[PDB]
């Protein structure tokens, strides 16, 4: 919904996200999946430089992604690491929603 929330929801300072901890908090409330981007914030913010009206943008470069995928046990996850482009909703020069991996 805004850049601060996007950072909290989708940017990780570690590749090896502790999914069973973080996904259990209110922000994620044991949902089935969440994609995290392993980067400091500025190169992620830069994806949306110049984009004012809300628009979905596919990254030009690939990034390190860490995905928390639920297992057969509720709120327990398998972490999957991959390198891919991703699509975000850019608004007023910052990411404000994560859309998907690989494609808009």
Residue numbers in the entry: 1 to 104
Sentences from the paper on this structure:
Onconase® (ONC, Alfacell Corporation, Somerset, NJ, USA) is a ribonuclease with anti-tumor activity isolated from oocytes of the Northern leopard frog, Rana pipiens. ONC is a member of the pancreatic ribonuclease superfamily whose archetypal member, ribonuclease A (RNase A; EC 3.1.27.5), holds a central position in the study of protein chemistry, enzymology and molecular evolution. Although ONC has only 30% sequence identity with RNase A, contains 20 fewer residues (104 versus 124) and possesses an alternative disulfide bonding arrangement, it has a highly similar α/β fold. The ribonucleolytic activity of ONC is essential to its cytotoxicity, and the target of this activity is intracellular RNA.
Redressing this, we have determined the X-ray crystal structure of ONC at atomic resolution. The atomic resolution structure of ONC·SO4 was determined from an orthorhombic crystal at 100 K. The data also enabled the resolution of discrete alternate conformations for the side chains of six residues (Asp18, Ile51, Ser54, Thr60, Thr83 and Asn84) to the extent that their 2Fo−Fc electron density is continuous when contoured at up to 1.4 σ. Hence, at the P1 subsite, residues Lys9, His10, His97 (the latter in the inactive, B conformation) and Phe98 (the counterparts of RNase A residues Gln11, His12, His119 and Phe120, respectively) coordinate a sulfate ion. The N-terminal pyroglutamate residue (Pca1), which serves to align Lys9 for catalysis, is now refined in a puckered conformation rather than the planar one described by the rtONC·SO4 coordinates. The refinement directs its side chain into a more extended conformation than that reported for rtONC·SO4, placing the Nζ atom 5.22 Å from the nearest sulfate O atom (cf. 5.37 Å in rtONC·SO4). This leaves it within hydrogen-bonding range of the O atom of Lys33 (2.92 Å distant) and the Oδ1 atom of Asn34 (3.03 Å distant), although it should be noted that electron density for Lys31 is lacking beyond Cδ, indicating that the side chain of this residue has significant mobility and most likely makes no firm hydrogen bonds in the presence of sulfate. The side chain of this residue is partially disordered with weak electron density beyond Cβ, and the refinement suggests that the major side chain rotamer intrudes into the space occupied by the bound pyrimidine. Comparison with the rtONC·SO4 data reveals that the low temperature used during X-ray diffraction brings about a 7.7% compaction in unit cell volume, with the largest reduction (5.8%) affecting the b axis. This is coincident with a compaction of the protein structure, as judged by a 2.0% reduction in solvent-excluded volume (from 13685 to 13409 Å3) and a 1.0% reduction in radius of gyration (from 13.736 to 13.603 Å). Furthermore, it indicates that a significant contribution to the compaction is made by the movement of lobes 1 and 2 towards one another. Our analyses of the present structure have, for the first time, identified appreciable collective motion in ONC.
